[PDB]
Design a protein around this ligand. Structure first.
Ligand SMILES: *[C@@H]1O[C@H](CO)[C@@H](O[C@@H]2O[C@H](CO)[C@@H](O[C@@H]3O[C@H](CO)[C@@H](O)[C@H](O[C@H]4O[C@H](CO)[C@@H](O)[C@H](O)[C@@H]4O)[C@@H]3O)[C@H](O)[C@H]2NC(C)=O)[C@H](O)[C@H]1NC(C)=O
Ligand SMILES: *[C@@H]1O[C@H](CO)[C@@H](O[C@@H]2O[C@H](CO)[C@@H](O[C@@H]3O[C@H](CO)[C@@H](O)[C@H](O[C@H]4O[C@H](CO)[C@@H](O)[C@H](O)[C@@H]4O)[C@@H]3O)[C@H](O)[C@H]2NC(C)=O)[C@H](O)[C@H]1NC(C)=O
Ligand SMILES: *[C@@H]1O[C@H](CO)[C@@H](O[C@@H]2O[C@H](CO)[C@@H](O[C@@H]3O[C@H](CO)[C@@H](O)[C@H](O[C@H]4O[C@H](CO)[C@@H](O)[C@H](O)[C@@H]4O)[C@@H]3O)[C@H](O)[C@H]2NC(C)=O)[C@H](O)[C@H]1NC(C)=O
Ligand SMILES: *[C@@H]1O[C@H](CO)[C@@H](O[C@@H]2O[C@H](CO)[C@@H](O[C@@H]3O[C@H](CO)[C@@H](O)[C@H](O)[C@@H]3O)[C@H](O)[C@H]2NC(C)=O)[C@H](O)[C@H]1NC(C)=O
Ligand SMILES: *[C@@H]1O[C@H](CO)[C@@H](O[C@@H]2O[C@H](CO)[C@@H](O[C@@H]3O[C@H](CO)[C@@H](O)[C@H](O)[C@@H]3O)[C@H](O)[C@H]2NC(C)=O)[C@H](O)[C@H]1NC(C)=O
Ligand SMILES: *[C@@H]1O[C@H](CO)[C@@H](O[C@@H]2O[C@H](CO)[C@@H](O[C@@H]3O[C@H](CO)[C@@H](O)[C@H](O)[C@@H]3O)[C@H](O)[C@H]2NC(C)=O)[C@H](O)[C@H]1NC(C)=O
Ligand SMILES: *[C@@H]1O[C@H](CO)[C@@H](O[C@@H]2O[C@H](CO)[C@@H](O[C@@H]3O[C@H](CO)[C@@H](O)[C@H](O)[C@@H]3O)[C@H](O)[C@H]2NC(C)=O)[C@H](O)[C@H]1NC(C)=O
Ligand SMILES: *[C@@H]1O[C@H](CO)[C@@H](O[C@@H]2O[C@H](CO)[C@@H](O[C@@H]3O[C@H](CO)[C@@H](O)[C@H](O)[C@@H]3O)[C@H](O)[C@H]2NC(C)=O)[C@H](O)[C@H]1NC(C)=O
Ligand SMILES: *[C@@H]1O[C@H](CO[C@@H]2O[C@@H](C)[C@@H](O)[C@@H](O)[C@@H]2O)[C@@H](O[C@@H]2O[C@H](CO)[C@@H](O)[C@H](O)[C@H]2NC(C)=O)[C@H](O)[C@H]1NC(C)=O
Ligand SMILES: *[C@@H]1O[C@H](CO[C@@H]2O[C@@H](C)[C@@H](O)[C@@H](O)[C@@H]2O)[C@@H](O[C@@H]2O[C@H](CO)[C@@H](O)[C@H](O)[C@H]2NC(C)=O)[C@H](O)[C@H]1NC(C)=O
Ligand SMILES: O=C(O)[C@H]1O[C@@H](O[C@@H]2[C@@H](O)[C@@H](O)OC[C@H]2O)[C@H](O)[C@@H](O[C@H]2OC[C@@H](O)[C@H](O)[C@H]2O)[C@@H]1O
Ligand SMILES: O=C(O)[C@H]1O[C@@H](O[C@@H]2[C@@H](O)[C@@H](O)OC[C@H]2O)[C@H](O)[C@@H](O[C@H]2OC[C@@H](O)[C@H](O)[C@H]2O)[C@@H]1O
Ligand SMILES: O=C(O)[C@H]1O[C@@H](O[C@@H]2[C@@H](O)[C@@H](O)OC[C@H]2O)[C@H](O)[C@@H](O[C@H]2OC[C@@H](O)[C@H](O)[C@H]2O)[C@@H]1O
Ligand SMILES: *[C@@H]1O[C@H](CO)[C@@H](O)[C@H](O)[C@H]1NC(C)=O
Ligand SMILES: *[C@@H]1O[C@H](CO)[C@@H](O)[C@H](O)[C@H]1NC(C)=O
Ligand SMILES: *[C@@H]1O[C@H](CO)[C@@H](O)[C@H](O)[C@H]1NC(C)=O
Ligand SMILES: *[C@@H]1O[C@H](CO)[C@@H](O)[C@H](O)[C@H]1NC(C)=O
Ligand SMILES: *[C@@H]1O[C@H](CO)[C@@H](O)[C@H](O)[C@H]1NC(C)=O
Ligand SMILES: *[C@@H]1O[C@H](CO)[C@@H](O)[C@H](O)[C@H]1NC(C)=O
Ligand SMILES: *[C@@H]1O[C@H](CO)[C@@H](O)[C@H](O)[C@H]1NC(C)=O
Ligand SMILES: *[C@@H]1O[C@H](CO)[C@@H](O)[C@H](O)[C@H]1NC(C)=O
Ligand SMILES: *[C@@H]1O[C@H](CO)[C@@H](O)[C@H](O)[C@H]1NC(C)=O
Lengths: 187, 166, 166, 187, 187, 166
């Protein structure tokens, strides 16, 4: 229907990346605020931008959680990669967690130039991990939401706005530790 | 470093040294086989998104067939293989194009030319997106013309070399 | 991975698919436009310092034009783009040459040949330094001679293929 | 004036890297001991090799500096990259700091095989960062200076010995964490 | 003696990588359980899979060892690389160390899905470092040994099963920190 | 990034732009010099294990000659130079082939063809191993035939271009 040079017909294909579920995580976007990363066909992480916080304490008991060793190792790996990918994170009170019973709950407090803030770094990482589709100087991002919440979930057809894709996670793998600050002289 | 994964031999004999995408790997649930000429470019080029997706799918298939698959995932395996399979900088470039308002590749859709009579095709190129929608074909028809010119020139040069050899 | 930044289209029409260095990018405060042939090498070579500097300058201009520049710098942007822009191992090689007492490139100065009559030029190559001073031309005149030989052989081969096609 | 193959005139060009100033830091060298890295047209870091120390305590209160969040984020990023690029750093007493009021002051004590010392690693990193042009075995560096001092500064024409260039910083970006030691079992 | 196309003789060569000894470490395999990494012609590390432990405490006094600065810096670098290459290490009691007098003794306790265990990660790292030639799901490794012990040693002809080679160490260099968990919010 | 180490000039004049492996670098304790054609491939290819071993040996020699060697080792030097010398992803590829049960290269042994009459050879390729033993020659004879085919095709094409030039 669209002929080029008289003898070349233009044809197209679209890849079904959903078939890769067993060997790599797949991220997708439901809408502007809600995104998912499924690991296999059983479990995954839902990341939500929201004004409604679910944690009201300042703890993130990562070492004790490692001690008990009840969480899903792949999900903990994804959490670690996400957090290590944030540029210039320097406000530890902005991050709270709950891991009791092997659950994964992580909450970033985005409340407050707006560029050199935890909100900007967290939001850039969030934009990169799903890459599914206000404006600030250079690469700076701002939103009206007060919290970013990351909780484990079971598989469900969440990909209403964008197709599942491994690209965001794979791209973020190289970002790990690239922009962390030193907090002591002997790492 | 640079990617290193060799594509496994194509199941279809129509393309002796090419590669075939089965019905599961495509949204249109059909079989698409590409010849050795188009697939050979994937061994030397560094900026072809399609060749990175081919390496990803081939790694997936081989891992499922040679390793005992279980539902629990070995995130470590892909973590170590990633840079042997794809150029992460291609991803970074598409991210940079996205944040600057330039049309970019989101790895879903690809276009290629088909020489109907012979069945020979070109290496698929990513269909760019802008403003939340795929680019209209008229916006990149110049690139399509360029691809057609390349397909003509390389073929002519091969026939010349043939005539030379005989 | 490998660099991926595509050079933006040259402002000067004299070099349709080349690249132009404006008065600001050069110490001699003049305009130098290089043709498509020389700039095409920058897409496939991995050891050309000049092509890495071209990618840096092009990234700078595009960032200044498409993003809202402010005096506070977004170190993050270059931190993420660096490996998409340049080969850091080229830098490592120049460091290693420096510490071994071998003449090395400090990315400041470049030489090229100009075919006066026609105006075609070669891809500029770094002018090496040693013991704190630039090498005298007689110390690397062999490389210049080699470049002239290359420009001859490649032009002749193109004319041959032309004659063949017609 | 030099003609090759009778038809090819040899011509030269030199790039003005100074124009890259808005998107990447630029390092240059004043002399053997004094080097500068400028970020934009308004601020930067001066690195001086000197026998005169400016800090006479053993503190480097990085975490308190982070919590107060008064410093320039780009400068702190540069400091972190420099320190993470040092090979085999294992003497935390050798590094002291002052961050009060958001300023940046970092002092490395270089006094004492000379190769397996803090002085060698610090000096190698310093030589790499500016790359502006005693002798040890292999890649080993030694000087007669007792201190390396890194302080924030305002913009000034400092580049008398070498031209400004981004090459040193970009090269060091890949050296980060490459040669750090483990200090605990759980990083 | 093997002629191809009537005119092409098939010939072979084998590289003597032993000659690289002065500029890079060389690893080799004695048998399934015993492997060695020599650094130069005088010193190196022997890594042994064994049922006989040599450490019966829970200490790994890395910081005191760093402060005392009596160990061989290259061996400490190799130890750090090995440990930082282990994926998903989250049980700090499984690693014990002795560094008194500049000596190096490291003991991993491999006793106990089997894939998400310290034993599997440690054994994958051990397999990678020497690469000298039961079976679990995906890349999973299991053995019957209770301990992996790493101690310094002097040079000796240990390479009965595999030739000395630098490939394993160099390959492991890129694995560093790639799969480490976060243990606090501010690294 | 990508490797950048240029090989130093060959001692043997028989191979003007090639490379020579002395008796110490080989188990059979003899000298083998490879010509410029084979060694030139090492500047552009990314998946040739032999060219990575050549770069390693050349770096070793240059470091021993230009730096004051001592018994205490400068681990840091190789740690910084490694990615300028070799593609670590090639290593990752061989590891992945090993764990999936595919024959893999352990960098010890290499085979090549020799055109007896003239003495010209091809670029050595790794002799793969599997289950603890070297592959029997009959298992990869197809690759040897392919290498011979390439040595013919390329030589004929060079002769064609020569005829064209004269
Ligand atoms: C790359 O960019 C393109 C262009 O922006 C983008 O294509 C879009 O994909 C989404 C998700 O697939 C499409 O949204 C679908 O649209 C229709 C009509 O609403 C419905 O069929 C879909 O909903 C059904 O199917 C979903 C998937 O199973 C279910 O979750 C849901 O409950 C419904 O059953 C869905 O909304 C959208 O139409 C296209 N846009 C265009 C212009 O084609 C693509 O996803 C991007 N890819 C990646 C990997 O980012
Ligand atoms: C790469 O290596 C080359 C060769 O070693 C090196 O070139 C040198 O650059 C320096 C710095 O530009 C030059 O020094 C200048 O020389 C003259 C005479 O003294 C003066 O014009 C300069 O001083 C004035 O300008 C400075 C800069 O504005 C001011 O700070 C100063 O107050 C003065 O106003 C300056 O001293 C030197 O001459 C050359 N050497 C040669 C042989 O050409 C180059 O810098 C290196 N590049 C990099 C990026 O490392
Ligand atoms: C790559 O894979 C190949 C094939 O799997 C592998 O080759 C094997 O190397 C080992 C180690 O060199 C060889 O074992 C030798 O065999 C004979 C007979 O037993 C002896 O000469 C050797 O023992 C003497 O020499 C040793 C070395 O000096 C001494 O340590 C020892 O005390 C003895 O004096 C040794 O056992 C084995 O025969 C080959 N196998 C084959 C099929 O050729 C090679 O090592 C692998 N390379 C790498 C780098 O991994
Ligand atoms: C996640 O990816 C896996 C792997 O690609 C998908 O499992 C695969 O599903 C397809 C389609 O159902 C199976 O193919 C079918 O298998 C049998 C014969 O083997 C038969 O029903 C059909 O002829 C067809 O070939 C395929 O075997 C299966 N692979 C495995 C290893 O189980 C899975 O569907 C994907 N999950 C999601 C949620 O998308
Ligand atoms: C997310 O972060 C915000 C911003 O830090 C938190 O709101 C802040 O809550 C603190 C108390 O925890 C408030 O400080 C107190 O405020 C008043 C005086 O303003 C007084 O009670 C005390 O002297 C103290 O200073 C702070 O003002 C407030 N900041 C705001 C509203 O902008 C918020 O609680 C955090 N969310 C969660 C779930 O922890
Ligand atoms: C920079 O580092 C040097 C070297 O460590 C410091 O000089 C050292 O100062 C200490 C005290 O802080 C001296 O130790 C003392 O020395 C004498 C006996 O020698 C005696 O008072 C005590 O028993 C104690 O051992 C040490 O000798 C001295 N080292 C030298 C001079 O080589 C220096 O203070 C540091 N500078 C700064 C500004 O921190
Ligand atoms: C560890 O590696 C070093 C460096 O490759 C080896 O030392 C080298 O040994 C060879 C063979 O003995 C020496 O070549 C000989 O040197 C002299 C003349 O210089 C003479 O005896 C012979 O004509 C021959 O050329 C070579 O010089 C020497 N290199 C250095 C830097 O000392 C050593 O053998 C290796 N050690 C082990 C245990 O494998
Ligand atoms: C290597 O790790 C293993 C497994 O953790 C260690 O064996 C364990 O030793 C502990 C004591 O250190 C035992 O716990 C005690 O066991 C009994 C009841 O089972 C009782 O005395 C106490 O209430 C306490 O729970 C544990 O059972 C045992 N686990 C086994 C044998 O599977 C082993 O000691 C470690 N090796 C070294 C050298 O430290
Ligand atoms: C979620 O709430 C924000 C505002 O949060 C409040 O204000 C913060 C500054 C802080 O004090 C919080 O604790 C408060 O709860 C809403 O932001 C508003 O958004 C509209 C539309 O963009 C804008 O016009 C208003 O100015 C914003 N108000 C403020 C105070 O910034 C946001 O809309 C809420 N989101 C949703 C989905 O309801
Ligand atoms: C700066 O001072 C050093 C000497 O520092 C002294 O010695 C140290 C070991 C330690 O005890 C310090 O507290 C002392 O203040 C000067 O080193 C001399 O340098 C010259 C020239 O190279 C050399 O001939 C002398 O032997 C050196 N002396 C020593 C003791 O090493 C150094 O020169 C001073 N730097 C400058 C720029 O003046
Ligand atoms: O910054 C460092 O790496 C070392 O800091 C040393 O000094 C501390 C201050 O920096 C501050 O953090 O808190 C007060 C001081 O203690 C630490 O003493 C040192 O800790 C190690 O020292 C040996 C041993 O006593 C400790 O358990 C170690 O953690 C830091 O490494
Ligand atoms: O080495 C480690 O990572 C853990 O060491 C554990 O044991 C300590 C010793 O190594 C030594 O440093 O000092 C004595 C021991 O405490 C630490 O206990 C552990 O710290 C965690 O322990 C629980 C909690 O109190 C801490 O905040 C955690 O960080 C190290 O991770
Ligand atoms: O996780 C972090 O980075 C900070 O944790 C803060 O809270 C601690 C808990 O996370 C848990 O580890 O143990 C109980 C709490 O103390 C720490 O308070 C904080 O320590 C820094 O805070 C400033 C200064 O007082 C300390 O010396 C710092 O280490 C962690 O950064
Ligand atoms: C996105 O979808 C979620 C889940 O249904 C819903 O709660 C939320 O309101 C939506 N967000 C936006 C911004 O529309
Ligand atoms: C996931 O797939 C496996 C097969 O690999 C199957 O056993 C299981 O039922 C699936 N789970 C769900 C929730 O569909
Ligand atoms: C999250 O994980 C925990 C631990 O396995 C599990 O009990 C819980 O059901 C999970 N939550 C959801 C919403 O699936
Ligand atoms: C190209 O066209 C031919 C002829 O219609 C068709 O059989 C073939 O499948 C097409 N190729 C692809 C890759 O779709
Ligand atoms: C080459 O020479 C021509 C003719 O003098 C001149 O116009 C042109 O600018 C030169 N090219 C460059 C790149 O300087
Ligand atoms: C380098 O320049 C600085 C700034 O003027 C000066 O303090 C110092 O003495 C100079 N160093 C040398 C060795 O001349
Ligand atoms: C730096 O440049 C900005 C414009 O980007 C200008 O407004 C400002 O005055 C300059 N600062 C200095 C100190 O020259
Ligand atoms: C491996 O060799 C060591 C050292 O001689 C020996 O103690 C041990 O028994 C051997 N292991 C096996 C499994 O044969
Ligand atoms: C190839 O054969 C010739 C003739 O026998 C011999 O001299 C030469 O050494 C051989 N080349 C190699 C690389 O072994």
């Amino acid at each position: 229907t669209s002929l080029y040079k008289g003898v070349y017909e233009l044809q197209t294909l679209e890849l079904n990346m959903e078939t890769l579920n067993m060997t790599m995580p797949l991220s997708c976007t439901k809408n502007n605020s809600h995104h998912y990363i499924m690991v296999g066909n059983e479990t995954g992480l839902e990341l939500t931008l929201t004004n409604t916080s679910i944690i009201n304490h300042k703890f993130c008991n990562l070492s004790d959680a490692h001690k008990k060793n009840l969480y899903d190792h792949a999900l903990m790996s994804i959490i670690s990669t996400f957090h290590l990918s944030i540029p210039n994170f320097n406000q530890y009170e902005a991050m709270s967690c709950d891991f009791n019973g092997g659950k994964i709950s992580v909450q970033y407090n985005l409340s407050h130039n707006h560029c050199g803030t935890v909100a900007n770094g967290v939001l850039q990482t969030f934009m990169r991990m799903a890459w599914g589709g206000g404006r600030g100087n250079w690469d700076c991002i701002m939103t009206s939401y007060q919290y970013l919440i990351i909780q484990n979930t079971t598989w469900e057809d969440h990909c209403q706005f964008s197709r599942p894709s491994p690209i965001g996670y794979l791209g973020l793998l190289s970002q790990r530790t690239r922009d962390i600050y030193i907090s002591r002289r002997l790492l | 470093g640079t990617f290193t994964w060799t594509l496994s031999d194509s199941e279809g004999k129509d393309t002796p040294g090419g590669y075939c995408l089965t019905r599961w790997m495509l949204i249109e649930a059909e079989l698409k086989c590409f010849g050795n000429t188009a697939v050979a470019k994937c061994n030397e080029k560094h900026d072809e998104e399609f060749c990175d997706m081919l390496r990803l799918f081939d790694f997936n298939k081989q891992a499922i067939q040679r390793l005992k698959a279980e539902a629990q995932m070995s995130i470590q395996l892909i973590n170590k293989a990633v840079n042997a399979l794809i150029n992460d900088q291609l991803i970074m470039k598409n991210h940079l194009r996205d944040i600057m308002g330039i049309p970019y590749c989101n790895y879903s859709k690809y276009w290629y030319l088909n020489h109907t009579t012979t069945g020979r095709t070109s290496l698929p190129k990513c269909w760019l997106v802008s403003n939340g929608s795929y680019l209209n074909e008229t916006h990149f028809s110049d690139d399509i013309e360029q691809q057609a010119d390349n397909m003509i020139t390389e073929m002519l040069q091969k026939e010349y070399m043939e005539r030379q050899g005989k």
